[PDB]
Design a protein around this ligand. Structure first.
Ligand SMILES: */C(=C/CCCCCCCCCCC)CCCCC(=O)O
Ligand SMILES: */C(=C/CCCCCCCCCCC)CCCCC(=O)O
Ligand SMILES: CCCCCCCCCCCC(=O)O
Ligand SMILES: CCCCCCCCCCCC(=O)O
Ligand SMILES: CCCCCCCCCCCC(=O)O
Ligand SMILES: CCCCCCCCCCCC(=O)O
Ligand SMILES: CCCCCCCC(=O)O
Ligand SMILES: CCCCCCCC(=O)O
Ligand SMILES: CCCCCCCC(=O)O
Ligand SMILES: CCCCCCCC(=O)O
Ligand SMILES: CCCCCC(=O)O
Ligand SMILES: CCCCCC(=O)O
Ligand SMILES: CCCCCC(=O)O
Ligand SMILES: [Ca+2]
Ligand SMILES: [Ca+2]
Ligand SMILES: [Cl-]
Ligand SMILES: [Cl-]
Ligand SMILES: [Cl-]
Ligand SMILES: [Cl-]
Ligand SMILES: [Mg+2]
Ligand SMILES: [Zn+2]
Ligand SMILES: [Zn+2]
Lengths: 382, 382
């Protein structure tokens, strides 16, 4: 029936809310009003889906949630992980988009922003498992999630990343992960955990769900005891240079997977050799762009608004090849780095920059159809 | 000891709220965050003020309110007018900025957008009065407002208009004044009349003030009987081509007043000869710009976002002279039309376009100081 033999799963980044979990008024994550990725690709005969995972949680938590979003079942973060970081072991339960997912039935994974990192970690778990959970279950018995066992291959065909901070971002180090802004983020999470809330911002495993008979005052008191306030097990930490390097250090290339990256630049060189945001950078990224663009290290300056070029091209010290727009992107086991998209800021990739008239719907349609063509090529050359 | 002998009164347009009457979060009308007109001009030693008049009412109602804002006292719309249109005769009461205002003590009037029309009408009333009110008080006795008497000269030194729709706008004819959008406007007025409201949107004379012990249900029922819903005595009507022509037809040049206009363009010619909004036009004016720019009559196309050039230059039936940036603007009795400001949309005149980095604070400062210099020169050449 579908043109693509393997389902495409699109994985949103940090802050992203999709589908039923998006607020009453809120942008459509995958394509804005410019090109409705899920709906349009379906109309054209492709089998595609948008994952829904934690908007504020760690790559770890998100990767576990991604697994269950696909397979179905009750999210299990692992006994060792839960005990180490101080959050619930078990989380939400998903219906599952492919309940028969197993070695032999493959999926294509495309990640925007942090979605790119989350995808890598989950493949890591399928192939190699999670050593601390393996050790924990050896020592103490119990059940261990099949996600943490290792030895599950032939499950992902491709990893494509768009504006992913593979090497982290200074906008995290110098803003997102500061004490003041973690508190803002966590307060937002506390609030949207109130008993009248219909949206899940992705930190309920830390206690941010008010009980039906609990007063707001008691709720405040209870969740102020949570480890979230001081933990590194959250998105803010993971998006830092250190946080991203840690993930780089525990990932490896899978020789059967087709890897490809896209990167935008939306800054220009000023006097002194610093980078400033172009007119047309979505305005909410103006200051973050300046922070990145005024780095002491010249090669860390050019950026898409919130992620520097050098972070998006590929994980540093993993094998890559610079590739053309025209040739097949069909090499396995190596990061195929696509030519930089000039004038594309971080959110132009997902079409939500309603202020930017240079970035047209028809252009974004071509961009997505291009990705699908590459995916079709991957299928054709097994 | 102010540098200017005559006080400068700035008069906002349609939708504008100022001072204490602005919502919790709302732009600073005169200068945005780019150049604080009132505060900065005061620091430099000028006596300036921002009038506060109805945001949604007619030029008539606004012009009465302007009079009382300056002179002080209880707003009196006139018995004949009240009876003809179906609203209260009396309105709010103002402290007065110049309680001694009379022939001999003059004021300079500068109006943005509809503010420009309001200023013309008020001076018309001072000089020539209101014949229907004169006739009504002849027939029925009682008190008549001094504003309606006629014979008051030597009270206004200058009339300067910025992006004023002297000849109306299609954005009114084809949108603002349609049935569906009048209802939206009136509903907003109804709501902001509720008993917890601290802001006056300028239509309480029509009944839109909920009583302290009245239920919302009863309020809805009462104000649905108001004539507002079908009247032309409102801003939406007055901003139309017909509405503006009517005002033109009943105003005249005062030979002792210095008249000057400014106009912006923020559209560009497309291949068919239609006008489209520049990048940089405040995005809320995007559609209104297209509507104006696709007019059948070519000379009605170029626009500032919501006002076509032909409308802003000067009232079409009144004398004008095209003037240079450098000529002293000291001619009396004729509209001195200042050269068009390229790239300035409707709201760039008041500095509220936070999305437009090409329009800097220092530019806006020069523009306002320019106006003051012209006003100073009007004083110097009596
Ligand atoms: C996904 C991740 C990359 C961003 C790295 C920068 C961290 C700065 C944090 C600011 C904190 C605000 C409380 C990007 C997904 C974008 C989706 C959207 O804009 O809706
Ligand atoms: C003052 C007058 C220019 C109005 C032109 C035409 C009417 C368009 C309809 C809008 C519909 C309302 C729902 C402009 C002063 C603007 C001030 C501000 O935006 O703060
Ligand atoms: C639009 C932002 C509104 C202002 C936020 C102030 C409240 C700070 C933190 C609130 C925490 C909570 O309600 O649980
Ligand atoms: C005493 C417990 C407090 C309950 C949570 C407060 C929720 C605030 C917002 C609710 C909005 C609504 O009810 O529609
Ligand atoms: C941004 C808020 C928009 C909500 C619009 C719905 C309300 C329609 C009419 C309400 C009239 C009234 O409450 O008197
Ligand atoms: C009979 C009901 C009349 C009062 C309803 C007015 C609605 C205003 C809501 C604003 C809430 C507040 O700040 O109290
Ligand atoms: C402004 C808050 C309104 C709803 C509060 C519900 C009360 C409760 O939790 O018992
Ligand atoms: C040059 C070595 C590449 C791997 C061979 C894959 C065979 C195929 O085309 O299915
Ligand atoms: C909840 C408060 C709403 C304020 C409406 C202001 C409209 C205007 O700009 O004229
Ligand atoms: C959602 C409405 C909250 C305010 C209650 C109105 C009070 C009253 O007039 O009785
Ligand atoms: C009430 C709206 C929630 C904000 C969701 C976000 O910023 O990801
Ligand atoms: C133009 C802005 C209006 C919003 C008014 C408020 O939320 O208080
Ligand atoms: C002046 C306000 C008009 C809003 C119309 C639009 O957003 O297309
Ligand atoms: Ca952009
Ligand atoms: Ca502008
Ligand atoms: Cl499995
Ligand atoms: Cl929730
Ligand atoms: Cl008088
Ligand atoms: Cl009021
Ligand atoms: Mg919901
Ligand atoms: Zn965790
Ligand atoms: Zn009236």
């Amino acid at each position: 029936q579908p043109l693509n033999k393997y389902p495409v799963v699109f994985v949103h980044g940090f802050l992203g809310l999709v589908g039923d979990n998006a607020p009453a008024l809120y942008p459509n994550y995958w394509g804005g009003n410019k090109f409705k990725v899920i709906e349009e690709l379906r109309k054209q005969g492709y089998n595609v889906h948008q994952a829904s995972v934690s908007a504020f949680g760690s790559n770890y938590d998100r990767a576990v949630q991604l697994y269950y979003y696909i397979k179905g079942g009750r999210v299990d973060y692992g006994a060792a992980h839960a005990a180490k970081y101080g959050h619930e072991r078990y989380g939400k339960t998903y219906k599952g988009i492919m309940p028969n997912w197993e070695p032999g039935k493959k999926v294509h994974l495309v990640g925007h922003s942090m979605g790119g990192q989350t995808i890598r970690l989950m493949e890591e778990f399928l192939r190699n498992g999670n050593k601390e959970e393996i050790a924990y279950h050896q020592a103490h018995g119990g059940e261990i999630s099949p996600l943490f066992t290792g030895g599950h291959n032939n499950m992902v065909a491709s990893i494509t990343t768009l504006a992913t901070p593979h090497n982290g971002s200074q906008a995290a180090d110098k803003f997102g992960n500061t004490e003041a802004v973690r508190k803002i983020m966590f307060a937002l999470n506390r609030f949207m955990g109130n008993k009248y809330s219909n949206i899940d911002l992705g930190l309920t495993q830390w206690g941010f769900k008010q009980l039906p008979n609990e007063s707001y005052i008691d709720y405040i008191k209870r969740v102020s005891k949570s480890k979230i306030w001081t933990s590194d097990d959250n998105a803010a930490y993971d998006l830092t240079l250190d946080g991203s390097a840690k993930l780089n250090n525990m990932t490896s290339m899978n020789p059967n997977i087709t890897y490809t990256t896209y990167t935008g630049v939306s800054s220009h060189t000023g006097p002194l050799g610093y980078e400033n945001p172009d007119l047309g950078t979505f305005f909410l990224m103006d200051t973050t762009s300046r922070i990145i663009g005024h780095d002491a290290r010249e090669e860390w300056r050019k950026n898409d608004g919130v992620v520097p070029v050098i972070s998006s091209l590929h994980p540093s010290n993993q094998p890559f090849v610079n590739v053309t727009n025209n040739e097949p992107a069909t090499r396995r086991g190596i990061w195929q780095v696509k030519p930089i998209l000039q004038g594309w800021d971080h959110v132009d990739f997902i079409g939500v920059d309603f202020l930017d008239f240079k970035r047209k719907g028809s252009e974004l349609a071509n961009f997505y159809i291009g990705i699908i063509n590459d995916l079709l090529s991957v299928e054709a050359t097994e």
